[PDB]
Amino acid sequence: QFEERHLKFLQQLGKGNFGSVEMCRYDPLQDNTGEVVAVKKLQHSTEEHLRDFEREIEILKSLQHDNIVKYKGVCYSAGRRNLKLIMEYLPYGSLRDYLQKHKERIDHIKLLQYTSQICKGMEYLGTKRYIHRDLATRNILVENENRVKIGDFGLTKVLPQDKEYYKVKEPGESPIFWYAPESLTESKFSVASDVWSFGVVLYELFTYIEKSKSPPAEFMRMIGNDKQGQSIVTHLIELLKNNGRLPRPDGCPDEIYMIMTECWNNNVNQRPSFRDLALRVDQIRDNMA
Numbered sequence: 001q002f003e004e005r006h007l008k009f010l011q012q013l014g015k016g017n018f019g020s021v022e023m024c025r026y027d028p029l030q031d032n033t034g035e036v037v038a039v040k041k042l043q044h045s046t047e048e049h050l051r052d053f054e055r056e057i058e059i060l061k062s063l064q065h066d067n068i069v070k071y072k073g074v075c076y077s078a079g080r081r082n083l084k085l086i087m088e089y090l091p092y093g094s095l096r097d098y099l100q101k102h103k104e105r106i107d108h109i110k111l112l113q114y115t116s117q118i119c120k121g122m123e124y125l126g127t128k129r130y131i132h133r134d135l136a137t138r139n140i141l142v143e144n145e146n147r148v149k150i151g152d153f154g155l156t157k158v159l160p161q162d163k164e165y166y167k168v169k170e171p172g173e174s175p176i177f178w179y180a181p182e183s184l185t186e187s188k189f190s191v192a193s194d195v196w197s198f199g200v201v202l203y204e205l206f207t208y209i210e211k212s213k214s215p216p217a218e219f220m221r222m223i224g225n226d227k228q229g230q231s232i233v234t235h236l237i238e239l240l241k242n243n244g245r246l247p248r249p250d251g252c253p254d255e256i257y258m259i260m261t262e263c264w265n266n267n268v269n270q271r272p273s274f275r276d277l278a279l280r281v282d283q284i285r286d287n288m289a
């Protein structure tokens with residue numbers, strides 16, 4: 001149980017259109033010896049966003065896996081109008097920041113160890129028919145030098161039993177440069193669209209988060225200056241339809257780029273499964289040694 005009066009703000013960790021994550025101390029003894037936790041809260045709270053947040057909390061509470069961030073509890077203290085999700089806090093931070101910082105000691109075998117773990121986490125979500133929808137290094141956390149965890153479930157949805165996709169028509173900001181074509185055009189999300197986004201995560205890893213090499217940076221460079229009265233998402237859809245793809249990262253092995261290109265198939269049914277991805281990654285890693 002978490003009492004609101006004992007949560008002490010330390011630092012901001014990240015932001016989403018309607019959500020924010022903060023590093024807080026939970027200090028019931030009020031002597032600064034309390035545990036440091038990660039607190040997720042709604043930015044501009046609504047009755048609709050609260051119900052969605054309740055679902056997100058039920059999703060994370062239902063997950064227990066070595067490569068999934070741990071649920072600690074909730075903090076209401078003021079009915080259902082100031083709901084907070086309490087999670088474990090990982091001092092090493094996001095994989096996005098860690099990779100950039102430690103790019104000299106992180107080798108390809110290490111990148112593939114993280115890749116394998118994300119795949120394992122994703123296969124586990126699949127057993128529960130959960131679609132993550134927002135896979136990105138920004139949302140992956142570093143437990144230690146040999147372990148990562150999927151750390152946010154803000155866009156995660158459960159598939160209904162009757163279909164293999166979830167349709168989401170909703171404002172505002174979508175991570176369009178991580179989205180599968182059918183997610184851009186039909187707002188259709190599936191295990192297959194999470195595989196496409198995984199391909200983009202694999203790309204982020206092998207660029208070591210070089211700012212000018214990010215998926216928005218590369219797609220924008222490919223779209224070019226000829227924007228002339230058309231939106232960026234219109235240009236992106238056309239580019240993907242015409243088989244335009246993110247380039248092979250500098251020093252990335254052909255076999256690893258092949259996995260990315262397979263994830264980025266226009267036909268959802270031709271994309272690999274997360275079990276096949278783990279097999280292929282684990283073996284490329286074993287061969288590197």
Ligand SMILES: CCCS(=O)(=O)N[C@H]1C[C@@H](N(C)c2ncnc3[nH]ccc23)C1
Nearest residue numbers: 014015016019021038088089090094152
């Ligand atoms: C709201 C949209 C998602 S976001 O803000 O783009 N990414 C999240 C911030 C968080 N993160 C870096 C964390 N850092 C350390 N410990 C942690 N536990 C739990 C989380 C967490 C992932």
